[PDB]
């Protein structure tokens, strides 16, 4: 049949693209990485360069230390046995301090202390990375939409391992570092709070999660459908509306009675996604602090 534009038919490559300079400190930018013909069939084949200033080195260091702290603990549980490590990889878990220890740091290393250390590194890694999303945009004179959207995800994460536990009075309320264990934590959290399906913010969070898939499926398909008119050149279409943008808009207007603009659809997009964790964080934060049982709460409201 006809080309669907899911994979490119022919790849072209030119000299490594070193990018825009603007106010970026080129001294902190690496050289270009290798080119991946594999990736090139779907998106850009070029890897790098990447920017790594002090803040970035800190974030990567902390992030790795977070990963390694959990990992060293996993090896311990495995008795330092490689075969056991792989066998029970998904079963290992770095648990938080017991309720007894409250919010103190007196818990033994093997009984909460290591979880606190790992968490500290994660805290530094994530917040320094956030600064990075802000600073990389600033150096290029771009808006700070990325940093603000990232903050929404950070909100749920902060609520889960820091804000809620503090308000609840103990680190024991936080999430453990483990594949199966964090799943068990999630199930237990719902059981203990009267079924999260009754939490209105959880219902909203789901609406936006499903909605994000609905919207990206809609937007991705639309742009591919009008790529024959250069529809993917979104910034160009915002600055000088082309037939690609008009047909995209009319497809939707004729289908559902209303439509967006090339710039506006990305505002629908950023909010649809951001609202997932925004409502989510609120729903979780209210659980146990203000509402002990959602089913019960729903009976009164």
């Amino acid at each position: 049949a006809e080309y669907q534009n899911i994979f490119s038919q022919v790849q072209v490559r030119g000299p490594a693209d070193l990018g825009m300079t603007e106010d970026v400190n080129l001294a902190n930018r690496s050289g270009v990485g290798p080119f991946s013909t594999l990736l090139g069939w779907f998106g850009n084949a070029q890897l790098g360069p990447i920017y790594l200033g002090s803040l970035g080195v800190l974030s990567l260091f902390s992030g790795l230390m977070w990963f390694f702290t959990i990992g060293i603990w996993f090896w311990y549980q495995a008795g330092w046995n490689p075969a056991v490590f792989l066998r029970d990889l998904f079963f290992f878990s770095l648990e938080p301090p017991a309720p007894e220890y409250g919010l103190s740091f007196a818990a033994p290393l093997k009984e909460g202390g290591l979880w606190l250390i790992a968490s500290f590194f994660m805290f530094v890694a994530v917040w320094s990375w956030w600064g990075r999303t802000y600073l990389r945009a600033q150096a290029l004179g771009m808006g700070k939409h990325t940093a603000w959207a990232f903050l929404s995800a950070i909100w749920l994460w902060m609520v889960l391992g820091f804000i809620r536990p503090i308000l609840m009075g103990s680190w024991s309320e936080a999430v453990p570092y483990g594949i199966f264990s964090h799943l068990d934590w999630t199930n237990n959290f719902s059981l203990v709070h009267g079924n999260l399906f009754y939490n209105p913010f959880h219902g909203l969070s789901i609406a936006f999660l499903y909605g994000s898939a609905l919207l990206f499926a809609m937007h991705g398909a639309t742009i591919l459908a009008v790529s024959r008119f250069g529809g993917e050149c979104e910034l160009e279409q915002i600055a000088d509306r082309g037939t690609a943008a008009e047909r995209a808009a009319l497809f939707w207007r004729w289908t559902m009675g209303f439509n967006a603009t090339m710039e506006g659809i990305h505002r629908w997009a950023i909010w649809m996604a951001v609202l997932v964790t925004l409502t989510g964080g609120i729903g979780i934060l209210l659980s146990g602090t203000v509402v002990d049982n959602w089913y019960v709460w729903g009976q009164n409201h």
Partner: protein, 281 residues
């Protein structure tokens, strides 16, 4: 009323059925044969839901719930008040959804654009059908399908999930969730990137795709590109739904025990099954 640039596109043609018979618009909406079909199916389904409400004794949007035939009825018909209405409404829903997709195809043909949208929508339709048709049929009863009620369908999700312990352990479900989370992540990033370029710091000129590439390369060492990000969003969203349908079609059919126990096949591998130490030893 029309958008200021709309008239030139409102030409005849593109219909799949009926020729020019239904080739027209009602306000902003395009009609077409499938527009008529969608209206019929949707209206009938909504009317039957309202009737199911009367038989239930409530007009409360929060309480109205249409249930499929009890397991005893198997895959056969059932009294309107005892599962029959659900069966008819399900047919209407399927008809309305498929008609909606075909109407989108006619719209694509009239606009001269690709057919990616209805193709993508078809995935949602297949997920729906997996839950109300394919899975129930494979299991032998319509009663395994979910009920049409705002809150009651959530009862179904909860009850169905716990039938297999913590449903988090369904491996296909894990993959599906990964795609849903990753999709939301990519959507936030895509929206933010385009907007950060179109709306730079006050007084500055609009940024360019070069700036978009540069921002992400500086940030994570890679930029998928504009064509790539829209292909990615589509792929992540459709993959999330594909694996969703998959995680349910295998549940209650090929696997019906506690999902958590499925993982023992990995722990029981001969080369490390009996090695002492760890969590499973």
């Amino acid at each position: 009323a029309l958008l200021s640039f709309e008239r030139k596109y409102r030409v005849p043609g593109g219909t799949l059925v009926g020729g020019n018979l239904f080739d027209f618009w009602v306000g902003p909406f395009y009609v077409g044969f499938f527009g008529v079909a969608t209206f019929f199916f949707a209206a009938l389904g909504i009317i039957l839901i309202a009737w199911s409400a009367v038989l239930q004794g409530t007009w409360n949007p929060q309480l109205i719930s249409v249930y499929p035939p009890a397991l005893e009825y198997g895959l056969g018909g059932a009294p309107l008040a005892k599962g029959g209405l659900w069966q008819i409404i399900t047919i209407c829903a399927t008809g309305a959804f498929v008609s909606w997709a075909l109407r989108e195809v006619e719209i694509c043909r009239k606009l001269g654009i690709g057919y990616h949208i209805p193709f993508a929508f078809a995935f949602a339709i297949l997920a729906y059908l997996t839950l109300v048709l394919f899975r129930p049929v494979m299991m032998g009863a319509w009663g395994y399908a979910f009920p049409y009620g705002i809150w009651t369908h959530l009862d179904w999700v909860s009850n169905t999930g716990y039938t297999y312990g913590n449903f988090h352990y369904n491996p296909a479900h894990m993959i599906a969730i990964s795609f849903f989370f990753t999709n939301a992540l990519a959507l936030a990033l895509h929206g933010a990137l385009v907007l950060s370029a179109a709306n730079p710091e006050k007084g500055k000129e609009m940024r360019t795709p070069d700036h978009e590439n540069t921002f992400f390369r500086d940030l994570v060492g890679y930029s998928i590109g504009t064509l790539g990000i829209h292909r990615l969003g589509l792929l992540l969203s459709l993959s999330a739904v594909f694996f969703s349908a998959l995680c349910m079609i295998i549940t209650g059919t090929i696997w019906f025990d506690q999902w958590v126990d499925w993982w023992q096949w990995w722990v029981k591998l001969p080369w490390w099954a009996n090695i002492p130490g760890g969590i499973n030893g």
